[PDB]
Amino acid sequence: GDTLCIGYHANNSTDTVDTVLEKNVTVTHSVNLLEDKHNGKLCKLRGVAPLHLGKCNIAGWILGNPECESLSTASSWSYIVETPSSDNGTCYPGDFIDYEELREQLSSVSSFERFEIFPKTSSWPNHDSNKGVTAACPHAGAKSFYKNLIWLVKKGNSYPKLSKSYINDKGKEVLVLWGIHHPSTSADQQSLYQNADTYVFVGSSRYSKKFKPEIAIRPKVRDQEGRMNYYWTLVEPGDKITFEATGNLVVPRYAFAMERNAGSGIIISDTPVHDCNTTCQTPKGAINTSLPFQNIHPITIGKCPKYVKSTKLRLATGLRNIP
């Protein structure tokens, strides 16, 4: 007789999915929920390029290590990239105080402008601002120093008390950095600063600290038995910062007007930066997906899928495939 049969689609799909009752079920159609692809580039986040520091780290870049001079610094950036071999930092050995906090603060910036907070030519009439170089910070083989600080030294036989203030009229936060020098010996102290017993005081409406040099021979680092510590603070708009010293102060020369934005971070990678945008950046490449999960990298920046240890998340849409 005439017939009518009810049936269902089969095809040549080899796609498999797992189910709770059965692994590797072949289905006619399916979709992946797991992003496992990236473009191998470090891209612009929020349409803003990252600041790439080359062979410099943030300490070197922000202090103005001579080797970081040729780096270009935009007035804004979405995140910062260092490489795993970026070792040009504090060429004169010592401690960078609250350095991780600073990196975190600088990770993303909507506005950033270097300005000369204390001009070299006019700020220090009673001190020597031209002898503050060292073989610890060579540039082109010559003795040099950080671009953004000046290592003041006695003038003739004298280091009178220094007192220098700056009022933040930038309308935004000003990042001020400075150093405290800790000589290897009494003789070195006298040769540099004349005065044997010295102090440095830095103050703002918020900040207040006295520093005392600690003179001792330390094991040599980059040929220095002395040490230099580095400090920073953010000066609120309208606020005043004051430096005071009878020696040992590495004064600011350049400071940075800035507006920090939101929550970004720092990527440490050899992955090249490229003119591409993304909404999700990993250290090994950017992700462009709508998928809710990814197995590329746990450490991401942006609006990213959740990181999972999964190798496969295949969702059945079609039928068990039985051709």
Binding site: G1, C5, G7, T28, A262, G263, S264, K306, S310, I322
Partner: protein, 171 residues
């Protein structure tokens, strides 16, 4: 398996029905062939599309930067940060894995149900004017032309129109 049709009383699929997930094969005097049931298929497509879109779109993450940097004297908080990233990894990995396993089973159940329901809708119309010959097929006890076949797919088969003819051949 849950509903007894797919890989059940209908043993295999049809590579010849290419225009849809579920459908019909007919043979009558004026011809034979496969035709997908577009409606039942479209409903299933809309349902499954909604399902995929739900699993995807209910995840709406904010802009965040996962990484944190800690110095050598901050090992305890570095390990707290690690416990956080690893705790989230465990939750999400477990939950994504089970979600997929569990819903894949439900998707397959769903298709099985759709085929079962399609089959039952035909069976209920035909009653004894046809013979259920297994494997999801009905053998008509009467001539069923394309108009008739279509009435069956349409859910408006006229049982009394063919009941005399059918009863004759069925004896």
């Amino acid at each position: 398996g849950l509903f007894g049709a797919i890989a059940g009383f209908i043993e295999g699929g049809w590579t010849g029905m290419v225009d849809g997930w579920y459908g019909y094969h007919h043979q009558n005097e004026q011809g034979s062939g496969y035709a997908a049931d577009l409606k039942s298929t479209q409903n299933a497509i809309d349902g499954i599309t909604n399902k995929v879109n739900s699993v995807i779109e209910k995840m709406n993450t904010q802009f965040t930067a996962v990484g944190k940097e800690f110095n050598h004297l901050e090992k305890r908080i570095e390990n707290l940060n690690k416990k956080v990233d690893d705790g989230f990894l465990d939750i999400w990995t477990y939950n994504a894995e089970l979600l997929v396993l569990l819903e894949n089973e439900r998707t397959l159940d769903y298709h099985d149900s759709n085929v079962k329901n399609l089959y039952e809708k035909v069976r209920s119309q035909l009653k004894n004017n046809a013979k259920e010959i297994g494997n999801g097929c009905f053998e008509f006890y009467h001539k069923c032309d394309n108009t008739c076949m279509e009435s069956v797919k349409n859910g408006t088969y006229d049982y009394p129109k063919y009941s005399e003819e059918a009863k004759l051949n069925r004896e």
